Design a protein around this ligand. Structure first.
Ligand SMILES: Nc1ncnc2c1ncn2[C@@H]1O[C@H](COP(=O)(O)OP(=O)(O)O)[C@@H](O)[C@H]1O
Ligand code: BEF
Ligand SMILES: [Mg+2]
Lengths: 477, 431, 104
DNA sequence: TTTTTTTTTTTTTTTTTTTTTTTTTTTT
DNA sequence: AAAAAAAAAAAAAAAAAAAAAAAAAAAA
């Protein structure tokens, strides 16, 4: 076995193929010799050989399932040569598959025999396989024989693109991490793929989501998050940071709750100078809060975590670069687009937007004005007493309430607090409208268009100073 | 190239968008009063080609090329030129499949020299190689004569005459590009040496460290299979410090990537050697190519000057003791006696010599266009008429854009553009 | 029929080099340096060197060389990244920014 | 209609090329 | 004594490359 792996790593057939078919339905060496010459042997017989080996492997898996002292060593040995042979098949198929798409009919043929071998390998892996390999090193080597070719194949981009093969590989890895106790090896392989490639972050995120949701196993993703937090990067490549950022964004958008557990340590990544990493962290926090605000049980469980993530979201508005501020503005926009609680956070967002309208970054200005527009569109002060706000009318109502002022006491207190909050919001909106009318004369076409849209929305939601901006817009001719 | 239309907007006198078309690809002449804008049209044509010397076309900086500095309302100055790629022989190497090529240069108070090719933003370099590939190298022109510089042609240094000769047969566009390639390769070798230094300095000790970590695992594996007693368990617990259970896959990946890096480095060195050898053989060839070009241009120059003036001759010779590659000078013979110094020649004679040299260069390899500004300033009426007739009849080949104030050349001009300063700006009309 | 394929590959590679579409990813796919070494491609019908084609080949070779150097550099960066295993906040004061139509 | 890919266009940072003086020099 | 070429270095300005956002065409 070990000598066979050492040799393999260091390094008219049709007549014998029919003989092997009949025997299966020193012959062992003949099959290996036949399988060793795939690059030269015709593509016709390869399909039949792959189908035959898949059928034999499925039959043996069914026999093992039916059975479960017994003939344990014999079955273990037979599975060992079958695993070696399927590894040889996988290596020879990824050979020239790396060559193609680097023609297309051969690509379809190779992919089809690949899904056949994937069903065969899933049928193999579905069994417990624990008692037959008593020693952990033997099990580790046997399953590495299966997994390493899978990662070498995932190195190829179309393999990751094709959904059937992607799903089969994800299922294989999920079953492994769930039952064979190889979380460390799988995590190391995934981290190597992430640090060496850019097209596997989405694959890793989807695999982690599948493992979590359909196996109740968050340990692998928690360990991956801890390792990502503790890693350090060099300035020259930035490809590792970019892949990590993409993986974090995808994981946040898919499954936020599980990653919330390790986000406390993940936050430490913000101290790095990586623009991509900082943007990914802030966008991940925003996605987590946005997709966790839906579940009242989730708020009741993670009030403190959601509060600290939101607080970091407001605090990250101050940075030298504009990109993290822009990502924080999108996070705030998602939060305010959510129809939920945290009117205090909404008021803080309003204050931050009106304060940051004067940023030197045109992108940040555009995003702040868009945030203010969405705030105007979905302000909480519209459930009762209409949806139109006016300074004089609100002041008159506040004065009337003050003049009129247990149950009645608390009702008046709540009404006064609501009116004061509305007055503050309207004053902030008036200041924002004045600043946006001043800023409208800007070079950026997108900025001008979005400021015009904000002014139109403000005029529609009748405001005393809105006509001012309207005149400014008339002046844009 | 056979330019067919020219668009000038906000450039010097032409403040309004003036589009001039119907360019006859045989002989185009521009006429008008003093200050009408003919030289302004030539300056606009020079602008789009990518001229760098600002003092050349009557200017000091990029701002004064706009109608009235940054003032008077006009803020941007754009010049657009459109050629014809019907003939693929005289076509850009990189744009043979794209007919009707267009080049636009725009200058703004804020921006600087924005270039568009076929509507797509392109760098200044891109248009530089685009125009150099069609012999329109305006930085060292071989077809461009400004106003008042016709009599100074014989006053240029022998190095500039050598550059003029090298502009033909593709000898130019090669010295500067080899120099730039050498600079780029020298700069890249610094980075290559840096990567090699990090490869041989830090990565290798890590290689021995991971090899030492590899042995530890081979033993620890046996220890585990026995454990699967108390002293062995204690030893196993104590040895769980540098076990690195996933050392095999990581070390295999590192070795594979290092092998790939070494192969790429070796192939890079091989490519460098091949490029150097190719450059050596190429310049060894261009030496003899320059020899042939010089001989042919000298013969054509002599023939043209003999034809223009019946009792004169001219030739191009190397220096007194230096070879051809050092420089080239002009020798003139009148009657049966050679002239030791060219400073005693007449202004008309100097203009005729310059025209004969330009026509010899055209006869060797005709440039796509030839632009002349006040070429007949020091020529009499008879010589002006003879030059115009010879351009119309015998030379042909290329497209001529000549600014003339005398009837001699534009009387028989195939196409005539007349300029008037009408109202604040300049307008161009047919005939 | 190798001549036609070589000419087609040469034309497409020169077009790509002119278009500035050569980068680190496609560096080890289009090797026109070999065609530069064999100068038969950049020759006319009279065994003469076409210097416009020579300049195009030199430009392509230099661009591919630079792209390959960048690829080697980023691979080395990846190797050190895989083998290697504050106060970014700034006060907001520095973030301040600090009649034409009718007049025109 | 929804999503992935192309590509084009927005700054920001760094790179390349210009033009300034500053001396240095030799033949008449 | 006296007139004009010429090598040399730093400051300013044009310009290219990196990186992300917006817009149009294409496949499921
Ligand atoms: N930057 C500029 N802004 C405004 N006017 C200009 C500028 N440069 C040149 N002009 C005007 O354009 C005219 C150019 O005349 P020109 O074309 O040289 O006449 P000709 O073609 O007869 O030689 C000049 O009279 C000058 O006053
Ligand atoms: F100086 Be003369 F009129 F050629
Ligand atoms: Mg003039």
């Amino acid at each position: 076995l070990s000598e066979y792996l050492t040799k393999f790593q260091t390094t008219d057939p049709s007549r014998e193929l029919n003989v092997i078919i009949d025997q299966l339905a020193d012959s062992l060496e003949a099959l290996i010799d036949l399988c060793h010459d795939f690059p030269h042997l015709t593509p016709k017989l390869q399909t039949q050989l792959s189908y035959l080996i898949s059928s034999s492997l499925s039959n043996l898996s069914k026999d093992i399932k039916a059975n479960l002292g017994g003939l344990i060593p014999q079955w273990k040995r037979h599975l060992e040569e079958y695993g070696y042979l399927i590894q040889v098949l996988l290596t020879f198929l990824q050979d020239e598959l790396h060559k193609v798409s680097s023609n297309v009919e051969l690509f379809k043929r190779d992919c089809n025999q690949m899904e056949n071998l994937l069903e065969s390998i899933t049928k193999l892996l579905e069994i417990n396989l624990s008692k037959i390999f008593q020693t952990t090193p033997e099990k580790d080597l046997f399953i590495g024989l299966f997994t390493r070719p899978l990662f070498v194949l995932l190195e190829i981009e179309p393999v990751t693109k094709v959904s059937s093969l992607k799903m089969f590989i994800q299922r294989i890895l999920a079953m492994c991490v769930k039952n064979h106790g190889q979380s460390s090896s799988i995590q190391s392989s995934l981290m190597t793929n992430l640090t060496y490639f850019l097209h596997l972050s989405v694959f890793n995120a989807e695999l982690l989501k599948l493992l979590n949701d359909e196996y109740n196993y968050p340990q692998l993703t928690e360990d991956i998050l801890k390792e990502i937090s503790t890693r350090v990067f060099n300035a020259k490549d930035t490809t590792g940071p970019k892949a990590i950022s993409n993986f974090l964004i995808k994981l946040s958008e898919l499954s936020p709750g599980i990653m919330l557990r390790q986000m406390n340590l993940v936050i430490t990544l913000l101290n790095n100078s990586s623009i991509t990493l900082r943007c990914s962290v802030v966008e991940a926090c925003g996605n987590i809060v946005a997709e966790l605000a839906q579940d009242p049980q989730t708020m009741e469980h993670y009030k403190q975590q959601i509060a600290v993530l939101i607080e970091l979201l407001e605090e990250r508005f101050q940075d030298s670069n504009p990109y993290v501020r822009t990502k924080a503005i999108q996070g705030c926009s998602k939060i305010c687009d959510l129809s939920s609680k945290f009117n205090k956070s909404k008021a803080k967002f309003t204050s931050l937007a009106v304060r940051s309208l004067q940023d030197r970054s045109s992108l940040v200005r555009r995003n702040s004005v868009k945030l203010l527009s969405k705030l105007l569109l979905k302000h909480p002060f519209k459930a009762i007493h209409g949806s139109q706000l006016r300074l004089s009318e609100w002041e008159e109502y506040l004065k009337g309430s003050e003049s009129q002022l247990t149950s009645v006491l608390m009702k008046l207190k709540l009404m006064i607090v609501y009116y004061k909050d509305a007055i503050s919001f309207i004053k902030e909106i008036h200041k924002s409208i004045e600043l946006i009318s001043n800023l409208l004369f800007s070079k950026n076409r997108n900025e001008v268009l979005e400021s015009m849209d904000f002014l139109v929305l403000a005029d529609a939601f009748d405001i005393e100073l809105s006509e001012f901006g309207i005149k400014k817009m008339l002046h844009l001719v | 190239m056979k330019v067919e239309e020219l668009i000038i907007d906000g450039f010097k006198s032409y403040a309004t968008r003036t589009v001039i078309t119907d360019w006859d690809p045989q002989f185009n002449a521009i006429t008008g009063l003093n200050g009408s804008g003919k030289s302004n049209i030539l300056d606009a044509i020079c602008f789009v080609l990518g001229i760098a010397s600002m003092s050349t076309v009557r200017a000091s900086s990029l701002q004064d090329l706009i109608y009235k500095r940054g003032q008077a309302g006009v803020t941007k100055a754009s010049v657009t030129i459109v050629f014809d790629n019907t003939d693929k022989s005289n076509s850009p190497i990189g744009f043979t499949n794209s007919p009707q090529i267009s080049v636009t240069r725009q200058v703004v108070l804020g921006g600087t020299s924005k270039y568009l090719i076929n509507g797509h933003r392109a760098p200044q370099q891109s248009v530089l190689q685009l125009f150099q590939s069609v012999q329109l190298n305006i930085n060292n022109p071989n077809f461009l004569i400004m106003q008042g510089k016709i009599t100074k042609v014989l006053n240029m240094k022998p190095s500039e005459i050598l550059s003029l000769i090298e502009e033909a047969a593709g000898t130019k566009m090669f010295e500067d590009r080899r120099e730039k390639a050498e600079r780029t390769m020298s700069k890249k070798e610094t980075k290559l040496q840096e990567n090699r230094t990090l490869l041989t300095e830090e990565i290798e000790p890590k290689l021995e460290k991971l090899r030492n970590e590899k042995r530890m695992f081979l033993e620890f594996q046996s220890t585990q299979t026995d454990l699967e007693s108390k002293q062995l368990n204690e030893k196993f617990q104590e040895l769980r410090k540098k076990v690195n259970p996933n050392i095999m896959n990581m070390i295999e990946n590192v070795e594979k990537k290092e092998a790939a890096l070494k192969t790429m480095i070796k192939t890079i060195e091989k490519d460098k050697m091949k490029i150097q050898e190719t450059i050596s053989k190429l310049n060894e060839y261009k030496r003899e190519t320059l020899v042939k070009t010089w001989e042919k241009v000298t013969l054509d120059f002599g023939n043209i000057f003999a034809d223009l003036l019946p009792n004169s001759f001219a030739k191009l010779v190397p220096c007194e003791g230096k070879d051809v590659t050092q420089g080239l000078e002009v020798k003139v013979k009148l009657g049966n006696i050679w002239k030791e110094s060219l400073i005693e020649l007449s202004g008309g004679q100097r203009s005729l010599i310059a025209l004969s040299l330009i026509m010899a260069l055209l006869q060797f390899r005709p440039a796509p266009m030839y632009i002349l500004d006040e070429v007949d300033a020091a020529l009499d009426l008879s010589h002006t008429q003879n030059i115009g007739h010879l351009i119309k009849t015998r030379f042909k080949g290329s497209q001529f854009i000549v600014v003339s104030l005398k009837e001699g050349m534009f009387a028989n001009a195939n196409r005539v553009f007349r300029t008037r300063f009408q109202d604040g700006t300049s307008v161009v009309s047919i005939m | 029929t190798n001549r036609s394929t070589m000419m087609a590959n040469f034309e497409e590679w020169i077009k790509m080099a002119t278009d500035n579409k050569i980068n680190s990813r496609n560096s080890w796919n289009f090797a026109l340096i070999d065609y530069f070494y064999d100068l038969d491609v950049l020759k006319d019908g009279e065994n003469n060197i076409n210097f416009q084609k020579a300049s195009a080949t030199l430009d392509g070779c230099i661009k591919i060389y630079s792209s390959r150097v960048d690829s080697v550099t980023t691979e080395t960066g990846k190797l050190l990244s895989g083998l290697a295993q504050e106060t970014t906040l700034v006060e907001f004061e520095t973030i301040k920014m600090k009649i034409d139509p009718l007049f025109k």
